[PDB]
Ligand binder design. Structure first.
Ligand SMILES: CC[C@@H]([C@H](C)O)n1ncn(-c2ccc(N3CCN(c4ccc(OC[C@@H]5CO[C@@](Cn6cncn6)(c6ccc(F)cc6F)C5)cc4)CC3)cc2)c1=O
Ligand code: HEM
Ligand SMILES: [Ca+2]
Ligand SMILES: [Ca+2]
Length: 450
């Protein structure tokens, strides 16, 4: 029959209050009370939490006409744009648009991306000086504004960042997104909308300029190392032959940038903080760096590909502090889950955060221990033991780019600086759509070469 329910505090509002304090502890506590599968009413939505790795196969492999992503993420429409990704006309159109972004994330582009990271960090160290203190979360966000933008859109974007305040516009859009919008997609957000329109105008101009650059220098279209997402959007069509609109191209780029920034800056923050705060982990990370770097003075792709221990450190931060804490779908048909049937219209929920603290999978889950993955392989105990990037048909298409960006940034920063974190590693703050550490996140730095 139906899964057990979390008793409602009030009708309609349901369990919103305990939920919004800490959605992760809400799921944990209620798992303990009600088991692997339970339902809560939350601001009018029937939400059915799936809380053990064991049962997740049917969730991750269902077709979009059974478990719809578009029904639950459509709320992002005022950020991304009408007709884009989860507001696309169909599952099919969404998948095609996602492929246009994946199409600028090639090996050839990754070799160039390393150079971009080196270049932006070198600019940034001029601000930072020989020593100081800096907020970790801000530093990473600031770096990734410039790196993600240039990686996805090309170098032509940088003059807008440097001269037309584009980075402030991003913040205006992105602080304009409340997680509450998931329940109330029509919440007014006029500052967000003003900024989104401004970025729209700038990106329209970037498209217009690229078009005539394609005329002046069509060889660009033949060089895989110089082809970016803007180039692919300007020269591709849907499979059925329908051309894209410039409004669709703008929205895809904004969606791509949004994806390319927040989850990465947050992950590089939690990763760096935990690395520099743990003497044994820092030793190993630096020993690995010194071996891979050898006599060379700058990074390249092949070097990053060898940073296995640093990668493990990132995965361990992803276990502990996954930035997307809830993966959702709407049930378009009733769904069997173990002994239960989950009603049509219910929203099924999987939490990477809950999974990462599951003590059936992880021993001492509150401890940052990259060796739990590299030596003890604790993630491998279940097919869905670790799902920070999703799984199945909708698994993150950005995973390798995020790995590259975060490993590269943390590698280059280490090369430049000794760094120590000030204070206790914070708790996550659940006030934002993409979850990051509670501010402030400060560290001291000092340059390693006079
Ligand atoms: C602050 C007021 C406060 C008051 C005081 O209570 N409050 N306090 C607490 N709560 C509260 C807390 C939690 C919630 N829930 C938490 C879960 N939320 C949620 C839903 C969907 C999300 O999906 C984002 C999609 C998936 O993938 C992305 C991202 N991405 C993928 N890779 C890289 N980036 C993506 C994909 C493709 C693209 F191309 C682009 C993209 F971006 C976008 C993320 C999060 C909603 C419900 C609700 C309310 C409050 O309301
Ligand atoms: C550490 C960084 C990141 C994490 C933790 C992350 C996590 C996720 C997760 C969980 C999903 C699955 C959402 C769902 O099934 O409901 C996802 C989907 C996606 N991510 Fe990421 N992501 C990261 C970086 C990126 C980057 C860099 C990009 C692009 C440049 C990107 C683009 C996407 C896209 C386009 C999807 C949609 C796939 C689909 O619906 O078919 N992500 N990511
Ligand atoms: Ca409650
Ligand atoms: Ca779960």
């Amino acid at each position: 029959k139906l899964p057990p329910r979390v008793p409602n505090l009030i009708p309609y509002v349901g369990s919103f209050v305990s939920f919004a304090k800490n959605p992760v502890q809400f799921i944990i506590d209620n798992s303990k009370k009600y088991g692997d599968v339970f339902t809560a009413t939350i601001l009018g939505k029937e939400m059915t939490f799936l809380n053990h790795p064991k049962i997740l196969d049917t969730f991750f492999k269902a077709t979009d006409n059974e478990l719809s992503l578009r029904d639950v993420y459509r709320f992002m429409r005022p950020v991304f744009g009408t007709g884009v990704v989860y507001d696309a006309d169909s599952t099919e159109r969404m998948m095609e648009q996602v492929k246009f972004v994946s199409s600028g994330l090639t090996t050839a582009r990754f070799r160039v991306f390393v150079d971009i990271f080196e270049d932006e960090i070198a600019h940034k160290v001029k601000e930072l000086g020989p020593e100081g203190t800096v907020d970790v979360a801000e530093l990473m966000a600031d770096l990734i504004i410039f790196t993600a933008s240039r990686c996805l859109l090309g170098d032509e974007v940088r003059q807008y960042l440097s001269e037309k305040n584009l980075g402030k516009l991003y913040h205006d859009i992105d602080d304009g997104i409340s997680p509450l919008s998931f329940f109330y997609p029509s919440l007014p957000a006029p500052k967000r909308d003003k900024a989104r329109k401004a970025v729209g105008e700038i990106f329209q101009e970037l498209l217009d300029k690229r078009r005539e650059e394609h005329k002046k220098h069509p060889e660009r279209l033949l060089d895989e190392s110089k082809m970016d997402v803007v180039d692919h959007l300007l020269t591709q069509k849907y499979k059925d032959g329908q051309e894209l609109t410039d409004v669709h191209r703008i929205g895809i780029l904004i969606a791509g940038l949004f994806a390319g920034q927040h989850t990465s800056s947050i992950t590089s923050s939690w990763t760096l903080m935990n690395v520099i705060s743990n003497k044994k982990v820092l030793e190993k990370v630096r020993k690995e760096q010194e071996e891979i770097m050898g006599s060379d003075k700058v990074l390249d792709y092949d070097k990053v590909m060898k940073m296995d221990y640093l990668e493990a450190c990132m995965k361990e931060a992803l276990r502990m502090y996954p930035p997307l804490i809830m993966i959702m779908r709407m049930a378009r048909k009733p769904r069997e889950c173990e002994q239960y049937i989950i009603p049509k219209g219910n929203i099924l929920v999987v939490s990477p955060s809950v999974a990462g603290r599951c003590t059936d999978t992880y021993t001492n889950p509150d401890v940052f221990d990259p060796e739990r993955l590299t030596e003890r392989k604790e993630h491998e105990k279940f097919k869905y033991g670790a799902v920070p990037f999703g799984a199945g048909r909708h698994k993150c298409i950005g995973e390798n780019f995020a790995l590259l960006q975060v490993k590269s940034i943390i590698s280059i920063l280490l090369r430049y600086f000794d760094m120590e974190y000030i204070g206790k590693i914070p708790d996550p703050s659940y006030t934002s759509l993409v979850v990051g550490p509670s501010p402030p996140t400060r560290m001291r730095y000092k340059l390693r070469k006079q």
